[PDB]
Design an enzyme around this catalytic site. Structure first.
Site, short mmCIF file in Angstrom:
data_model
loop_
_atom_site.label_atom_id
_atom_site.label_comp_id
_atom_site.label_asym_id
_atom_site.label_seq_id
_atom_site.Cartn_x
_atom_site.Cartn_y
_atom_site.Cartn_z
N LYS A 1 -13.73 40.76 5.43
CA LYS A 1 -12.35 40.51 5.08
C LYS A 1 -12.26 39.12 4.39
O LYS A 1 -12.26 38.07 5.04
CB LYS A 1 -11.43 40.60 6.31
CG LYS A 1 -9.98 41.02 6.05
CD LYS A 1 -9.17 40.16 5.10
CE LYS A 1 -8.80 38.80 5.69
NZ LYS A 1 -8.08 37.91 4.77
N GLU B 1 -16.86 29.59 13.39
CA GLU B 1 -17.07 28.22 12.82
C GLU B 1 -15.74 27.74 12.30
O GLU B 1 -15.07 28.35 11.41
CB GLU B 1 -18.11 28.13 11.73
CG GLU B 1 -18.41 26.67 11.30
CD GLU B 1 -17.79 26.29 10.00
OE1 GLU B 1 -18.32 26.68 8.92
OE2 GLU B 1 -16.79 25.59 10.09
N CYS C 1 -15.52 21.92 5.66
CA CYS C 1 -15.46 21.90 7.10
C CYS C 1 -16.14 20.63 7.66
O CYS C 1 -15.65 20.03 8.60
CB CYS C 1 -16.16 23.17 7.65
SG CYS C 1 -17.84 23.47 6.96
N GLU D 1 -7.65 17.52 11.00
CA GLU D 1 -8.34 17.91 9.78
C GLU D 1 -7.36 18.01 8.60
O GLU D 1 -6.45 18.85 8.59
CB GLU D 1 -9.00 19.29 9.94
CG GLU D 1 -9.80 19.74 8.74
CD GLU D 1 -10.60 21.01 9.04
OE1 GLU D 1 -9.93 22.01 9.43
OE2 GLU D 1 -11.86 20.96 8.96
N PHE E 1 -8.30 18.22 5.17
CA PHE E 1 -8.78 19.19 4.18
C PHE E 1 -8.28 18.91 2.75
O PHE E 1 -8.01 19.82 1.94
CB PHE E 1 -8.45 20.64 4.61
CG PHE E 1 -9.65 21.55 4.64
CD1 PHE E 1 -10.72 21.24 5.50
CD2 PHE E 1 -9.70 22.74 3.92
CE1 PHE E 1 -11.81 22.06 5.59
CE2 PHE E 1 -10.81 23.59 4.02
CZ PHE E 1 -11.87 23.23 4.83
#
Ligand SMILES: NC(=O)c1ccc[n+]([C@@H]2O[C@H](COP(=O)([O-])OP(=O)(O)OC[C@H]3O[C@@H](n4cnc5c(N)ncnc54)[C@H](O)[C@@H]3O)[C@@H](O)[C@H]2O)c1
Ligand SMILES: *C[C@@H]1CN(C(=O)CCCCC)c2cc(O)c3ccccc3c21
Ligand SMILES: [Mg+2]
Ligand SMILES: [Mg+2]
Ligand SMILES: [Mg+2]
Ligand SMILES: [Mg+2]
Lengths: 494, 494, 494, 494
Positions: free
Chosen positions: B186, B262, B296, B393, B395
């Site tokens: 997916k 993860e 990540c 985070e 990003f």
């Protein structure tokens, strides 16, 4: 906290051990065993030769037959027995340590703490592997189910030296037995006594008859009968590079038995200018002087970078003068004798050659006393690569200190030997620790330490310092023979 | 030689892939896919949902049946097929890199060199493991022969993000197929296109139908249908922590499917005063800024020892000013946009919170351009542990610089997070390199580097950064299910 | 040779065990513990709840800190401590076995020989792995030195059942401790007492404080506080599939802690017409009736090939009538009670459902006596797949015998369940033994035997019978978290 | 699709290969190479001797130096290069199969399908291991970080026979190069040609010069110069037992080079009365007759249980009559010649001894044709253990059939040889399959098949059939040398 050694030790186990029984030599001959510190006779031992080895090999072979107690026993029980043996060593630790000190010229508290501690730890490690030696299932091509068995190799002949007699004994039998082999062990003629005591403990622990056999005696007789035997599946040997070549040759000539060897060394220890000097001096020192310089791994080429060379020499000489020679059972003695007259003279001759060839004698440099095989701890500086003392394994308390300036040069010089047992590097630089340890042709490389030997690590030589590894996971596996079984099936699925 | 990117790209693979065929969505709905640099629509793709996932899961289940081509094929043929696929990716590299760059906002030369290179290497690595995944034979107690099979787990649902779409796709399917599993993939709704191209290559390479199925679509629809599915044996997810929690919860509520995750990070990068500064500045900088900060593993808490902190800040700030923002297909652009509006706004909100909470804005700090989701490269200094920009985070291209003076303090501060994906340490001290790397609660610790990810290494998080490892030897064993077979025999022998 | 049980056993350890000390519950509440054979109260135990779990978790976390005695201890010493613990179990074997029989309704000589033997063997196996859990060095791409550490996972919460209380206790703590974890253990409310005694032995063996903590109490209180705890790194659970789902869900909702589960089964045992019938009948029988049918792995679907079905039924019924029910400490008793009233009633209800749904009651089929939870051993024949007794885990002395004719059909029927813990096959045909064991979706498959469980083998379920494996090499590794360390170097060499 | 063989083959590669270049012999001598079917000369090849080996060894040593391309290349690039080589063999398959058939006397369709197929598969397998050869990190006692490197051994001399020349060539170089070693290959004097063609492909694939060197020439000259060489780190040999002894002896006398040997066999094939007869007859027949009986693993003692012995003999005899002898390139020929005169005469002498010692000659028994070294397929029955044809490796198309009636007897008789390469067992009994395979002293045991050899499996002998294993996981570890690195640290943590 170390107890007082036993003083009036009486000997009991002096015979050949076969099928858990004590036998006289077939010839009836016996040979004497001495205390190297006093030159007194300790006792006499049955002198095993070819015909005794042949009985021992028959015993080991029968114990290894399909259906026998040792072959059908649970792997976990082989482990249990090995731990029971270590319990018995602990119970007999004072006796063994005293005995080892007396027979081997070994400092008693070292024998008690280090040797005996090592013996126990080794056996416990080995015990733990017994039911963890595993084969594989393999997704091979075609409609087949394939697996492997890690079977024992068989009858393993094990020939050992005089420097760490009991410890070497357990290094050999522990992994062999853990993997399910049977053994015929040939202790050094200088140092049979602790091994013979172990026979009594093997029987007491419950090992089946014929699983361990011990044949004391000389090398070219009993030793050679093992290496040449047509029904020994494997020979493992620790000792001189010279006899190692004879063992491999004999294995070839006879039945192509598997061979494993550990043969001593000329190990370099390289000290870079950014090293912690206190740390480095003490490790380098112990690394060459331990047990009167009678370690395979002795740091017998000490390479020191130019800008710290003079200081390292000074500190090393100061460190080398802090010994009290004498009887290794006597409180306060910190250096014992060499093992026997042959070694003593070998070492004196090498010391003379360093004088003759222009090395700088900084301390020691001759014998001591008039009884027992004592040599003063000796340091030489300004040693060069072409000197006998830089090339040949001395096996005595004789340190060689040499200078270098270039990194690439010191690596080529370290590597320029037929030996490859171990090496040390002292630096605080991450890059050098990794890349230099990669470039050295040595089986073990220590970084900011020296002489750190533990049962969890495989141990052995590159080049002419050895074939194979002992201990760790890797050693264990070399006491197994792999069998692949491939079964035809109607249809395989992942 | 990085070639010119294709410009006039025509789309071909826009449907749901099941049993090696292309299908419309069951509802007939499609959803639009955009170029984030230009906001223009690239194409529409079929909107997969629960009923399309159910079809894909039946296909994968059937392909996994005992006796099917995929189950009965030689493991080594699984490997050949993976290598053939890597050949096809090589053939189609320019097209895939172009597509990846257009759909993902990704610097085209980076897509061609790094992402595509990594795709190929990952598959080649996986291919080699296929016939090397082995079980055991086990010396268990009693008169038994015991072995283990390392079987595939079965039907694995694999849900992936938008930041390295094709590389994540191959990170999931490579190991899964190597080990003999079937999959339902997916892709992220933002970035389905390279994955759909991969379907064509999976068919062309010759994999049996049903071995890989791909269902483009949204998260709470298609993703959730996978995680809740009563006939999926394992779900593997890379993405946000928030959604990882939902997946694990869904697995527990449904059929106890195996779960690997993860989940991103807040990775610390610790620069000691003894570090090489030029090296540390560049690695720390690429470590947080790579792919518009959308990694990540981004080095998003940069701890610098006080004695070098100001210099390090100055140099980091200068480095952060050397970017040209624009379309990532245009020669000379060195920073593309953020993936989408939601990410863009999350980053600006976090930048704002740094200003408000008292961080020192050194450069950047707001948007750029009048089209596409671009943000200026931003550096904050004097960041403290309690700040949103130190905890969350981000990003995006936002670097946090903080200082420390004690080793113990900085370890405790590095570790004080629910994340644990990766960390870096810059020092030349051997002791610090080993001991600090041991003490950091992070899955990958880099020393004197950062962002070094390779197929041979296991990769994944401690704590809330993940469950399980991907790639390396260790990864491959989490795409297997262990079966023990124990067979009574008349008598066991070692 | 089994000694007489202790008769007048006095209880001593009834409190919560934290940091090697005994604590009252924070609430002060206590809960009663009963003998299931007599319904008498044995004693009362402190009732642990969330606040007690929180103290235990703090203790475990502190013991796991970098620099602590448990983290810095030699791996080989963790092993030594585990063997010392097994020595203490051996010393206390009579006491523990009696206690286990009294609290658990377990036949005393089984508790003495099998449970206690298993406890000791398990710990010895585990001890052996402590210094043999190893990571890797990896030849990754680029100028890097890469290695891995197999570190402990951390604080592991361990929730266990009432059927094999002490054995399950050691199955959890042995591997966890061998790998260096710290634990918080939650014994079943029915059966805390032997676990609490173990606390005294853990302290006596020398384990550092906080390494094992034990919190007796109920499931939805103390159990749920563990599964939901924000500072527990891993939860391992054995018990019902229903609570297993709640544990996984809670792990997802809270901190994504790692999850391992073993959840019981509906294990098929398939007997082909060429099987040795004597062997097969006895194994199938023990396989479902052992410990009053209270084994996870119970052979609770017995498929017998048509041409031997009637005879197998006859022999099975004859075998099932050879029991003497009563107090499991009493000489001559060969069947004890079920554990408590909830189970007793569950089982009676299922027995009623088999009567209602048309299975043929061959023997037993109701309660026995008027004190304690006793059920007559019951066999049903002509059972069909849609019956409750064919679908649901009964956990009582109730055997289901079913017929088949086709090989392909019996495989599909065996596999048609959400369970997958174990299975058995009885045949003398090589091909069937291999291919059928490959096709069964079960974690352990026995061939011509049943219920053979040994520490050297990994153990656990496919599908909803479990996540992960326990014991063997494979289990050990699941109590480790992999850390990859990658160090930049100037030049790499092979 | 087996294509037509080439006819008019022109030779190109006839020299000594060193540093990726072609050289004349130092003496200028050449030696002739023949087609054994026609006795015509194919070409002449340069006669390599000691001085050419010395040149090859310097080249291999230099290519192995720290910092060389081969040492510093990524392991995964070693793998790529091996796969590229396999591609080249695929490209050149028809040419190599033709050459192999002409030079070796080998059935052309077998060369094309079996030998060449196997070459390709072997290299693909090896390629995949390259970046998966890993060392360990080890939780040793004390405050140390210890790891191991699995380094290449170094310069490996590899000496090979005439029966599967190209496949043996790849069996040697594949694993060696995978693990990063350099090699000096010495092909059989009868069959150098395909190996020399391989040099061209090694160059074309891009391997660094000096990584593979090939020295065609005779055994006591070039072979012996390798085995005695003071700068070869390991010798690997496949061939006769006699010469294996010489190699092992030479290694011992020279520099203690590591030695692995595969030496042929007298492999037993045991057919129990419960076996599928059609299956057993065909496998046993192909097992001894394949490639004119010139397989190390030939099933040359066929033990058949008395109740089926006559039938088995009758059927074996009928099967042995279905051959057409001739030129192995001619369509419809199904048996080629023996390799050379010496082998031809050894076989006839052994056939003669069977007649003389009282074996029953069932068919064949002498030569055929007027050109080339052809021998009729021969079957002897009523063979007994003391006969030369029951003890000695014949290496021609000669089947020995003997009978047995007791399981214990037949195991003891199977095992009563100094050989131990392989064995087969035909039975449908599970217990016999596992227990007899365990009891046979043979490296590979096949069950209900024979001659199933695959790259994923380790292959080699017990006893005088060899030292060491080739291929599979296990093989690869004997092309490495283990180095332990132990680094002092301030404090260790688990
Ligand atoms: N696999 C096994 O060995 C096993 C063992 C016991 C029971 N079971 C199955 O489960 C059935 C019911 O038995 P049970 O009710 O005694 O088992 P259970 O799953 O309720 O209890 C097992 C353990 O989990 C704890 N627990 C209970 N509820 C919890 C929760 N909400 N959160 C966390 N921990 C919790 C208990 O206190 C005990 O320590 C049995 O009839 C049997 O079918 C299987
Ligand atoms: C409950 C199950 C059965 N079992 C036995 O020992 C039965 C043997 C009977 C014939 C004498 C057993 C043993 C151990 O160790 C277990 C561990 C874990 C789960 C189940 C069991 C069982
Ligand atoms: Mg000598
Ligand atoms: Mg989201
Ligand atoms: Mg419950
Ligand atoms: Mg010859």
């Amino acid at each position: 906290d170390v107890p007082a050694p036993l003083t009036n030790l009486q000997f009991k186990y002096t015979k050949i051990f076969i099928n858990n029984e004590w036998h006289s030599s077939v010839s009836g001959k016996k040979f004497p065993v001495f205390n190297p510190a006093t030159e007194e006779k300790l006792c006499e031992v049955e002198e095993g030769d070819k015909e005794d080895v042949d009985k021992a090999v028959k015993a080991a072979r029968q114990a290894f037959q399909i259906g026998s107690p040792w072959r059908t026993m649970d792997a976990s029980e082989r482990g249990r027995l090995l731990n029971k043996l270590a319990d018995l060593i602990e119970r007999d630790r004072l006796l063994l340590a005293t005995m080892e000190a007396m027979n081997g010229g070994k400092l008693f508290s070292n024998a008690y703490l280090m040797d005996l501690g090592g013996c126990i730890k080794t056996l416990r490690y080995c015990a733990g592997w017994a039911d963890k030696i595993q084969g594989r299932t393999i997704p091979m091509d075609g409609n087949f189910f394939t697996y492997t068995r890690s079977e024992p190799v068989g009858v393993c002949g094990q020939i050992i030296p005089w420097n760490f007699p009991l410890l070497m004994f357990l290094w050999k039998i522990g992994p062999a037995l853990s993997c399910g082999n049977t053994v015929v062990v040939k202790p050094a003629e200088q140092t049979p006594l602790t091994a013979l005591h172990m026979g009594s403990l093997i029987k007491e622990a419950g090992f089946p008859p014929g699983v361990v056999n011990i044949v004391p005696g000389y090398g070219p007789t009993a030793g050679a009968a093992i290496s040449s035997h047509m029904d020994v599946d494997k020979v493992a040997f620790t000792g001189s590079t010279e006899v190692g070549k004879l063992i491999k040759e004999a294995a070839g000539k006879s039945n192509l038995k598997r061979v494993s060897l550990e043969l001593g060394g000329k190990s370099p220890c390289i000290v870079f200018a950014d090293a912690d000097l206190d740390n480095a001096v003490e490790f380098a020192h112990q690394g060459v002087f331990y047990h009167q310089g009678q370690c395979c791994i002795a740091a017998s080429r000490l390479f020191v970078e130019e800008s710290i060379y003079d200081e390292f020499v000074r500190r090393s000489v100061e460190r080398a003068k802090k010994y009290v020679l004498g009887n290794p059972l006597t409180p306060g003695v910190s250096q014992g004798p060499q093992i026997d007259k042959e070694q003593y003279e070998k070492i004196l001759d090498l010391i003379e050659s360093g004088k003759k060839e222009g090395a700088k004698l900084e301390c020691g440099g001759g014998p001591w006393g008039n009884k027992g095989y004592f040599i003063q701890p000796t340091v030489f500086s300004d040693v060069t690569d072409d000197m006998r003392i830089a090339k040949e394994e001395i096996f005595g308390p004789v340190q060689q200190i040499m200078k270098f300036k270039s990194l690439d040069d010191v690596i080529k010089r370290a590597n320029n030997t037929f030996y490859g047992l171990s090496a040390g590097i002292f630096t605080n630089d991450i890059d050098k620790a990794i890349t230099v340890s990669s470039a050295l042709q040595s089986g073990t490389v220590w970084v900011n330490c020296y002489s750190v030997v533990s049962a969890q690590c495989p141990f052995g030589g590159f080049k002419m310092s050895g074939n194979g590894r002992e201990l760790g996971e890797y050693g264990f596996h070399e006491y197994t023979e792999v069998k692949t079984v491939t079964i035809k099936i109607s249809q395989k699925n992942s």
